[PDB]
Amino acid sequence: TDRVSVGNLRIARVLYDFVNNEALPGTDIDPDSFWAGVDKVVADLTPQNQALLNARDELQAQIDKWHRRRVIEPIDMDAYRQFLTEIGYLLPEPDDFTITTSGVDAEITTTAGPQLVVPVLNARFALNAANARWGSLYDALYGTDVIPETDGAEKGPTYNKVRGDKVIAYARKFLDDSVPLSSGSFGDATGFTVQDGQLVVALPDKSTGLANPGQFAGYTGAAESPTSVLLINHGLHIEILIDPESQVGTTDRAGVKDVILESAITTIMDFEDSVAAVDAADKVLGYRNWLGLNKGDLAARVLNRDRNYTAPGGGQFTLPGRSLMFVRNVGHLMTNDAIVDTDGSEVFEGIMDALFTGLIAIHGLKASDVGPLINSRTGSIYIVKPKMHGPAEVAFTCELFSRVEDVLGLPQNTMKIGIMDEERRTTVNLKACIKAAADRVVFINTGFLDRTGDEIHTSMEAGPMVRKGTMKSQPWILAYEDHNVDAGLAAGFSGRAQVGKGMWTMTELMADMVETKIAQPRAGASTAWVPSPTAATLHALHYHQVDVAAVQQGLAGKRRATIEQLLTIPLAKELAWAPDEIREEVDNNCQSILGYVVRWVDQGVGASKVPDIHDVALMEDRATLRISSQLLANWLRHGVITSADVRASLERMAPLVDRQNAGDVAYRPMAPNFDDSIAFLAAQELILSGAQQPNGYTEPILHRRRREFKARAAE
Ligand SMILES: O=C(O)c1cc2ccc(Br)cc2[nH]1
Ligand SMILES: [Mg+2]
Numbered sequence: 001t002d003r004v005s006v007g008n009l010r011i012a013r014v015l016y017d018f019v020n021n022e023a024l025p026g027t028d029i030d031p032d033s034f035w036a037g038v039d040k041v042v043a044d045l046t047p048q049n050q051a052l053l054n055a056r057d058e059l060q061a062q063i064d065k066w067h068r069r070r071v072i073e074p075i076d077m078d079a080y081r082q083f084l085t086e087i088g089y090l091l092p093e094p095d096d097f098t099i100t101t102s103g104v105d106a107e108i109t110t111t112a113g114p115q116l117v118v119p120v121l122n123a124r125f126a127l128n129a130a131n132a133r134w135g136s137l138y139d140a141l142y143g144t145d146v147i148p149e150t151d152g153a154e155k156g157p158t159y160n161k162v163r164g165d166k167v168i169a170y171a172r173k174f175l176d177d178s179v180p181l182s183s184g185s186f187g188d189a190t191g192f193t194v195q196d197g198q199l200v201v202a203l204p205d206k207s208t209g210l211a212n213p214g215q216f217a218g219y220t221g222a223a224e225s226p227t228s229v230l231l232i233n234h235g236l237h238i239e240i241l242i243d244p245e246s247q248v249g250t251t252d253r254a255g256v257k258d259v260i261l262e263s264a265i266t267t268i269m270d271f272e273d274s275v276a277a278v279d280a281a282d283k284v285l286g287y288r289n290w291l292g293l294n295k296g297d298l299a300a301r302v303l304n305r306d307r308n309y310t311a312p313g314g315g316q317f318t319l320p321g322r323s324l325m326f327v328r329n330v331g332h333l334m335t336n337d338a339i340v341d342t343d344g345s346e347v348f349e350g351i352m353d354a355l356f357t358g359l360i361a362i363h364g365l366k367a368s369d370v371g372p373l374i375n376s377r378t379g380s381i382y383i384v385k386p387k388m389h390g391p392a393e394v395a396f397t398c399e400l401f402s403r404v405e406d407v408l409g410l411p412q413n414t415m416k417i418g419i420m421d422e423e424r425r426t427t428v429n430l431k432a433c434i435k436a437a438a439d440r441v442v443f444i445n446t447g448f449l450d451r452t453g454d455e456i457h458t459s460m461e462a463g464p465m466v467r468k469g470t471m472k473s474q475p476w477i478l479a480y481e482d483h484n485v486d487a488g489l490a491a492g493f494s495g496r497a498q499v500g501k502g503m504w505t506m507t508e509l510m511a512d513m514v515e516t517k518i519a520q521p522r523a524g525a526s527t528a529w530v531p532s533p534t535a536a537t538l539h540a541l542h543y544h545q546v547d548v549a550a551v552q553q554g555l556a557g558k559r560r561a562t563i564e565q566l567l568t569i570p571l572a573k574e575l576a577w578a579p580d581e582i583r584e585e586v587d588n589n590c591q592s593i594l595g596y597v598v599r600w601v602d603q604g605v606g607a608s609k610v611p612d613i614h615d616v617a618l619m620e621d622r623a624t625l626r627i628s629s630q631l632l633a634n635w636l637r638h639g640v641i642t643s644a645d646v647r648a649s650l651e652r653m654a655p656l657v658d659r660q661n662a663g664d665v666a667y668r669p670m671a672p673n674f675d676d677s678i679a680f681l682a683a684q685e686l687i688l689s690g691a692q693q694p695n696g697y698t699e700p701i702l703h704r705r706r707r708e709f710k711a712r713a714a715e
């Protein structure tokens with residue numbers, strides 16, 4: 001083979017060369033010290049990595065048996081909780097504490113705002129995200145259904161004046177709500193000027209200043225006829241662009257061209273659930289894009305530079321032009337053949353991600369070429385770590401980060417941790433999980449998909465679960481959402497680390513997003529996930545309407561969730577569903593699996609706008625597979641459906657997916673030759689082997705099937 005021997009490791013050549021030629025130069029790390037470190041860290045930490053994965057299976061086995069000997073209708077919460085405590089699943093709660101995490105950027109410690117997540121393997125998307133720090137509000141309004149496409153206000157080939165007028169009015173209203181005038185409305189502004197460091201807005205009848213002049217943050221152009229005005233509200237900037245000669249500016253009372261909002265304050269470049277990466281080739285593509293972003297030289301479009309402004313009093317200043325980047329590494333489960341050992345055993349992918357994304361991140365802590373340093377001025381590397389189960393697994397990641405920092409020559413705790421709360425064993429020991437990482441943690445967050453998937457698999461043997469749609473409102477998940485916020489606040493996250501909530505998946509349903517996603521900052525989340533720059537701009541509105549810092553101070557000391565509520569298994573009652581309801585749900589789940597799987601297996605796409613069964617565009621990641629396949633495996637497990645019901649739904653849904661994909665030049669149909677489609681067979685396997693996958697994880701099956709596809713495409 002073409003691997004490179006380094007101690008006990010055999011490294012794929014494409015990876016060894018990438019690291020040597022691209023990642024290493026410019027960091028002042030000795031190439032052979034790095035590699036010796038790779039070998040050493042892998043040899044030392046692999047056994048604990050494996051022991052932790054064994055511990056999961058052991059606990060799950062004991063819970064499986066607990067339910068299997070029960071036959072009793074509801075649940076004795078006291079005994080069940082007693083049981084979890086005996087087996088080491090529920091650990092004791094630690095005494096109160098405060099996180100000590102230092103060297104963290106303002107975007108993370110203090111600023112509340114939208115957070116974007118993007119597949120690192122897609123260079124175009126990755127760049128757009130990093131550039132999404134600042135976005136046009138007019139574009140985000142005119143382009144989506146936030147301004148409804150009613151009669152006369154439709155989007156056509158060219159600019160609708162009627163529709164654009166509603167866009168202007170909406171933004172005017174937002175300005176009045178966010179940066180109020182002393183009297184009058186922005187809707188009647190005629191001009192903007194700066195006199196003696198004060199913003200002066202001209203109305204048809206008279207002039208006026210801001211109610212709170214401290215919200216005036218700066219400007220560009222002449223004070224007496226500015227090209228823009230910079231405002232601030234709740235730590236987030238709002239820039240009014242003034243140009244009477246632009247398409248929209250001509251039609252405007254004050255000549256306003258656009259309202260630019262500081263939107264995606266941070267971005268997560270994702271190596272996990274939003275990308276398909278099953279070998280050395282795929283990892284290198286991802287690693288190379290992550291390198292290009294940190295060096296600032298990635299080009300597909302290029303990265304933006306910082307924005308210059310004139311301070312209210314006349315001095316010059318600069319604001320960041322790029323989203324501050326996190327990287328999401330893969331979790332503890334999977335191995336990857338990018339490196340194998342002497343026996344041919346693949347190496348843990350999580351361990352590899354820490355070494356390589358960490359190495360690569362050093363470039364983002366230093367001046368580019370294309371220019372000042374791209375990323376963390378405070379000297380931190382921000383790694384999101386998904387899918388952990390409990391405190392010992394968080395401590396293991398911390399210890400992994402610790403060992404890498406040495407190999408890298410970095411000061412201890414340079415590598416910060418973003419703790420995802422998306423597994424049940426983490427949820428019910430969340431405080432301990434935060435404590436285990438008290439000097440590294442820079443966020444926690446919640447979601448729906450992975451967390452519900454784990455919820456179902458954990459109580460798989462208990463009985464039939466409620467429908468997927470129903471899960472979103474179950475008592476366990478509402479308590480989980482609140483408990484997460486409470487735990488972070490109690491550990492001093494306010495002003496220190498992010499408290500995040502989940503993704504809006506419905507990329508075309510922006511009106512509903514603006515209307516409903518506001519619940520998240522109102523619940524005290526200092527950040528939440530968005531699927532696009534456009535969504536980031538719209539979700540930014542929510543941080544102007546809601547003072548997250550104030551909400552968090554008011555939540556202080558509260559415990560709004562009990563361990564009982566957290567532990568309330570989402571079992572369906574007797575006689576829950578009519579036959580047609582059962583079919584629709586089965587169709588719904590088979591459709592999401594097939595629609596997502598076909599693009600993953602056949603094209604190596606890990607995220608995209610996938611039409612659901614009712615043709616709504618969703619932008620979900622791989623966890624959609626986990627929840628769906630777990631729900632069907634649960635229904636199949638308990639007699640709700642038959643294997644023939646499952647077969648029929650896949651057959652009924654495959655042509656629909658085929659149809660929703662044409663569409664795509666590279667697409668290969670699944671119907672009517674099902675057992676010839678590796679993707680169709682993957683979908684089938686996920687459901688039918690679902691109950692036997694570790695904690696319901698889909699990567700073992702999905703990765704195998706993707707490799708199979710790649711091998712066939714090469715012969
Ligand atoms: O949890 C979700 O629904 C979700 C996560 C995620 C990451 C990247 C992209 Br693109 C879309 C996503 N959806
Ligand atoms: Mg997840």
Ligand SMILES: [Mg+2]
Binds near residue numbers: 572
């Ligand atoms: Mg239900």
